Scaffold this active site. Structure first.
Site, PDB file in Angstrom:
ATOM      1  N   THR A   1     138.218 166.976  81.676  1.00 28.95           N
ATOM      2  CA  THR A   1     136.946 167.700  81.924  1.00 28.95           C
ATOM      3  C   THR A   1     136.813 168.702  80.797  1.00 28.95           C
ATOM      4  OG1 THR A   1     137.982 169.343  83.352  1.00 28.95           O
ATOM      5  CG2 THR A   1     137.034 167.371  84.497  1.00 28.95           C
ATOM      6  N   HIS A   2     135.620 168.817  80.181  1.00 27.35           N
ATOM      7  CA  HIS A   2     135.431 169.694  79.002  1.00 27.35           C
ATOM      8  C   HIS A   2     136.348 169.216  77.861  1.00 27.35           C
ATOM      9  CE1 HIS A   2     133.474 172.767  81.577  1.00 27.35           C
ATOM     10  NE2 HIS A   2     134.448 172.515  82.453  1.00 27.35           N
TER      11      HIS A   2
ATOM     12  N   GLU B   1     129.841 150.735  68.806  1.00 26.71           N
ATOM     13  CA  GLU B   1     128.930 151.258  67.786  1.00 26.71           C
ATOM     14  C   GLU B   1     127.598 150.553  67.837  1.00 26.71           C
ATOM     15  OE1 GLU B   1     131.021 150.808  64.126  1.00 26.71           O
ATOM     16  OE2 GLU B   1     132.604 152.204  64.789  1.00 26.71           O
TER      17      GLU B   1
ATOM     18  N   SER C   1      93.167 147.483  70.500  1.00 24.37           N
ATOM     19  CA  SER C   1      92.964 146.660  71.687  1.00 24.37           C
ATOM     20  C   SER C   1      93.728 145.345  71.571  1.00 24.37           C
ATOM     21  CB  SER C   1      91.474 146.342  71.840  1.00 24.37           C
ATOM     22  OG  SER C   1      91.038 145.779  70.601  1.00 24.37           O
TER      23      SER C   1
ATOM     24  N   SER D   1     137.746 147.559  57.683  1.00 26.84           N
ATOM     25  CA  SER D   1     137.396 148.257  56.457  1.00 26.84           C
ATOM     26  C   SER D   1     137.523 147.403  55.212  1.00 26.84           C
ATOM     27  CB  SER D   1     138.310 149.472  56.320  1.00 26.84           C
ATOM     28  OG  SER D   1     138.131 150.155  55.089  1.00 26.84           O
TER      29      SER D   1
ATOM     30  N   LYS E   1     142.925 148.106  59.245  1.00 22.57           N
ATOM     31  CA  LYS E   1     142.163 148.938  60.169  1.00 22.57           C
ATOM     32  C   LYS E   1     141.191 148.063  60.954  1.00 22.57           C
ATOM     33  CE  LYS E   1     139.795 153.478  60.037  1.00 22.57           C
ATOM     34  NZ  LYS E   1     138.411 153.201  60.516  1.00 22.57           N
TER      35      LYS E   1
END
Lengths: 450, 456, 449, 451
Positions: free
Chosen positions: B177-178, B322, B95, B309, B315
């Protein structure tokens, strides 16, 4: 007050007293999302792993002894919890844990500088490593430690408390309830033997996931190929970690690519925790219902006071809900890896370590402050056993199911006992003597207690 | 550390603590997570206690000197001056009684410093129950989080995506698409889709406000209002609305539903979960469009935010997408916990309120903060690789279909096969095969292969 | 058109040709909810279990041989699938499966009546039994059979297809990708070795749950005490079931109360299936992304054409979503037992058996019609490996991370190779010879196959 | 038995492409549901009507499609859709199945139709399958679920009124609490269902958005510019589903299925409310002698194969099992919804299966719960009032007359002697000048305490 630090992206203003450097400060500014960073257990595993890596790099003659000694000393201070305020990065950072790995590298370099040793956070402190193998390794070390040294002993304590009640209440007869409706007799001891088995099965489920939860990615470096690490780096580091932690469950991964592209070991382990949460919900719900009322409820048992609200069953069922939610977050992150790296590790680590902590702490509290002190309302439980119309059940072989149904219906309608209704319906004869009726209707004998 | 004498026995409380014996007992009773009420929850409890004291004073039930002390103390709590005075675990009595007592004790200790003696229960909890106050403070916090923080953060993200939809209105590219090559689209059309998903997210949050803003205050122990003035709830809500400006706050349509269930939190979490689903799609498309530099799609360039990295030098990674997808996963998980707690109420009270409050308020906070960062540190600075995008669109076998009526299905397929083989545009392949003549002029070819026109 | 049947609640109108009786007909009218009943595998387990109970009751001399023979013959017909249209009750029935248990009892009594043998559905066909031990026993028999005889072999087939590709593509170098960004080299074979391990770990996860998934409640009767059953009923029935099915994984429960008050074995098993769905999602997603494009995508591999859209990876990821949903339903039902009985068994059984079937069928299809026929775009993959600026990484020990970062940044900006940028920045010397640079930058050697 | 086109069953109206999909996806063994098939028939008829109106399709071909599509929408060919739910993620296979069945129906009427060129004119599967899904979902919400919930609401509200003065003890944390009425509790349940209808109505503006006209990627390439608005106008006129509309943004309508995720959230909240209502009802009905025995549920079937005469709360059990299924389906829907990519979300057949099942289960179980359970409940009025009048929770109004200590002594003795608080006050001889019998009956009026 601020000082200038730099990384390969440029110069960064860092608070003057902070032990972290440019890359941690960028992460502080990029991810102010939850306002919560790594837990003590995560910082401990990162510090332990950084020290083990320096030891192996030193053993292989890749890192000068002065530099290795400086790293090992700084990493030990971090692992012991002397610098947790130097880890300000949010949980919701880059998905590899790059920022927390650089946080450990930068803080070690600053600690070593105070001792008069210059370390490069990448070239020296991170030698033979990547966040891609280090952050999930530290996560699986923390998870394995939580399972072996904390959760299994807590569950064993809860099992032993439940088993003690199963023994103490072996002949405390009561009415069984199925579908919430009056059923045949059971003992309170038998029900608690069921709860005890649910917890013992939980311990078996945790143990069953340890061969994959204890797998560490260490040595796979950037993508699992081990590039820029010695070929036996992983095996050597894991040996150091096993010797230092005493956790024989820690091992090198079966496949170095699977160990970084996926976090399936965490998904599996969360499934075991979710099953424990499911068992705990059943046990806690039965216990608060048995203690309900007194006037408006079942009033079977009395819970220790901490008018008594079942506060520990409420804490248990709330923790179970949290474990179920955490489990859904972990599976979602687990499925969404891509190619050589799953980038949901800080979120998955937060949730799995939290689920271990909540289950550990609430299981110990439930055992000691609720289960141990339960008292049974023996006379009331016996009266409940004897009042169920389903005590007519052992007469099925003598009078048949249909006649036994007519007996129960008439006894309820006429407010008579089952024994009296059998007599009144003229069922005493060759198929059922009065002595047999009385043997069959004895509620404690009907519970068939072992 | 000072010693406090209670009805059960004696208990030690930290010297600088404003909480008292009952809170210290709850600290000892629930060491489960080590995390207590969040800033927003503490603020809402302070707001509610001040409004209750104001109404008890107005109705002549509480002496003005006592009421003024509560109001001043409760305003300090609502202003976030005592966030370190609420040590009780989230995993407490269902409660939220323990946190309600924590607020009453802290208010009494603040008033004591001002020389006014307050009874935590008789004065600070006058006309109240925890069963109506803790879910009321939860719904105030959740309503404030939705209206004052999440909707403006989503509006900022919507406006950032809509600005890109407009800037890239004619940046033609191939559809997918796909995951396979498809007919042309523009990057602006895709970003118009993302902006609509966020606009629909704001509509979804606005749709849950009529029920999220319902407050249980005045229903007391079981919803009947026993031991409260009959108009206590309407008067408290009126004060809360006047002070906060949150016009969405209202007394509950049914006082029993408002305490027996927390369905408004389950409904609101559903809206947050849908926003997390939309943000997952938007963030995943963005990090895929930014993939590379040379082995991915390289459609757009994300702003650099930090070195990518510790091992691969130079990189740079899509760190904001993310963070967005990890927040979405957390919101999905929190949503499952909330629904689980919501279903398991019994009779007059749902006893999962502290767990449900933790989860919904966290989902609001995470979504608010990551939507603003996503808008400012990612969307606003995106740059499109316009020439690369148009060249791929102009080289697509999907754009040979408008040539069919001039050169035929077989020759259009031969054009498509040769363009892929020689890595040329469909236009250059038509010219190379010597198809320009009486049947097909260079002007007709440029009309038929106008990829921006194909994107409409 | 109809005939009159009766139960202890009264007379019921039953369709004239129906083999079920009064209690099944009440259930038909009480639960028209999903429009779907028990699956073939569930009816098979109920028929097998009813026959085993009659055999043991006959062996213990509790049931006359004529009656036991009639039950065993009828139960065999049901188990073989000759009467599935006689099981019309919805999945969403009373939570103990009472209605489906009485459906089996009533249909057996009607089959036996055609053979001239009168059986009472409760007194004879249900002798020594309860739905509380029978329905979860039949559920755990069906689940154990699904795991051992169907899912593990299907996963082994998928593992072997993935492992074959890991071997065939052992030296097919490509660029690794982390965070979707160019990383250091890997081989396509190494990635497929990772997928294969995920499936092998899935088989280990299924095997790990078998000691508890194979636990049967049979013999515990109404509440777990074994009232109205012989004391060795469970041990004897399980022996008959193991002999008939060949499933040595079937066993008596460790605790008879836990076996009926909870369905934690199903929650545990669903967790293993959910982890398999999670692995399958990663494998299927990587495979459709590797086959994406050709022009707008990665174009790393070519998927076999079946309808090229990646239709089998789409079927796989849709099945995984369904398994995740089913898993949430199972845990919800599993947590909500009360006292001596968990009353979510028909719902939990629907979902766990469906998850086993979908994973079994989609894993075999994915193995045979997608994985087996994949072809690699070898030249394109090599070019991708060589184009990543992260191939500068093996130079860290010679020039340091910061200088290597400056090399990668300059090579990308000037559109030069990493090798040329190292030369151009004058980094060749005592710490790095041209011969060492060329050894370090060889992408296949960099993959450390 | 079999006919060759690949071998196709003789009585099958599907053709080669559907038979290939049958061979390609043997996964679940379950195909499109009746509601999905109906929506595909409705959509194909409306498309043929619009192509005819715009002069793109010959009237004889359009009339053949419309007549064939009306047969499908009328549920005359539910056995002609054999393709698995787990198919290509756009639902292309089921779209081709519809086109082939329409062509085979029209062929019986002597009209030759090309499944792709005529039946699929101006369309893509990428806009048609999610359109048919949103039509089916909108119809399920408006025509079936809301009326079923309204029936359940009205049954609970009737009990809230009938039991307005049936006083009983409240229960908080499962422990004795101050008085309530059974009518007040049922008023709470009715509100939960009324809020459920409000939640479903709130999702209709986005659930009813249709992708039709957006073609392959949302641009409308190869369709008339007003194809979507004209098709929706026909659908609204024919079905009466005023909630159907062209999507606000054509790209969002194909790239995402967020309207299904939002709608599933509303269904999941209804499942959560139904769980609470059903659990409280089966607990109030528990017994006959070892439970709460507050109410009596109507007997629907014998409860046990072994415990004779036992009767169980089977309708509450079916309700809580449906709720568990809706929670599970909801997780599958959200999972599919998040994983779209670029111009198309490829989880549509799985999301459609799950949302349409959740609508169906909730609709059917809400009507059964209202009719076979709620309508016939009976209250144990005297038992409920006696417990309320014996509760230590009702001594608080005595405090101002006899004091806290004596009121607690009254509460302790009442529990000990199993008597009402009223009889305990009289037995302790507390009636006098300070407290009359009239004042005592006013102070202990439990119905007044419930307000």
């Amino acid at each position: 007050n601020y000082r200038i630090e730099h990384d390969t992206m440029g110069e960064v203003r860092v608070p003057a007293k902070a032990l972290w450097r440019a890359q941690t400060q960028r992460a502080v500014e990029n991810f102010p999302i939850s306002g919560r960073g790594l837990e003590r257990t995560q910082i401990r595993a990162l510090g332990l792993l950084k020290g083990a890596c320096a030891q192996v790099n030193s053993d292989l003659g890749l890192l000068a002894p002065e530099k290795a000694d400086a790293i090992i000393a700084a990493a030990a201070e971090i692992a012991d919890g002397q610098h947790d305020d130097q880890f300000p990065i949010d949980v919701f950072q880059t998905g590899s844990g790059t920022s927390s790995n650089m946080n450990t590298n930068e803080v070690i370099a600053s600690i070593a500088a105070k001792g008069g040793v210059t370390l490069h956070p990448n070239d020296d402190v991170n030698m033979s490593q990547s966040s891609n193998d280090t952050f999930p390794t530290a996560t699986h070390i923390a998870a394995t430690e939580a399972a072996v040294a904390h959760l299994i002993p807590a569950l064993q304590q809860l099992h032993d408390a439940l088993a003690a009640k199963a023994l103490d209440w072996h002949t405390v007869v009561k009415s069984g309830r199925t579908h919430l409706m009056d059923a045949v007799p059971v003992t309170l001891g038998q029900e608690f033997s069921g709860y005890a088995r649910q917890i013992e099965a939980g311990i078996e489920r945790v143990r069953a996931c340890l061969p994959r939860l204890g797998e560490l990615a260490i040595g796979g470096t950037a993508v699992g190929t081990g590039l820029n690490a010695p070929d036996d780096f992983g095996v050597r580091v894991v040996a150091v970690l096993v010797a230092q932690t005493g956790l024989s469950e820690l091992r090198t991964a079966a496949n170095s690519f699977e160990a970084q592209a996926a976090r399936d070991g965490l998904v599996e382990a969360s499934g075991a925790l979710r099953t424990i949460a499911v068992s705990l919900t059943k046990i806690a719900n039965d216990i608060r219902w048995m203690g309900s009322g007194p006037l408006t409820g079942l009033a079977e048992i009395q819970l220790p006071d901490l008018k008594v609200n079942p506060v520990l069953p409420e804490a248990v069922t709330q923790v179970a809900a949290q474990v179920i939610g955490n489990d859904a977050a972990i599976a979602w992150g687990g499925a969404n890896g891509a190619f050589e790296l799953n980038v949901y590790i800080p979120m998955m680590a937060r949730n799995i370590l939290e689920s271990f902590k909540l289950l550990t702490n609430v299981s110990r509290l439930f055992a000691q402050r609720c289960i141990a002190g339960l008292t049974a309302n023996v006379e009331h439980l016996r009266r409940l056993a004897e009042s169920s119309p389903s005590i007519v059940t052992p007469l099925n072989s003598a009078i048949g199911y249909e006649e036994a149904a007519a007996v129960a219906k008439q006894a309820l309608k006429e407010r008579k006992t089952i024994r009296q209704t059998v007599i009144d319906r003229g069922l005493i004869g060759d198929r059922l003597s009065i002595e047999d009726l009385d043997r069959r209707l004895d509620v404690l004998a009907m519970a068939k207690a072992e």
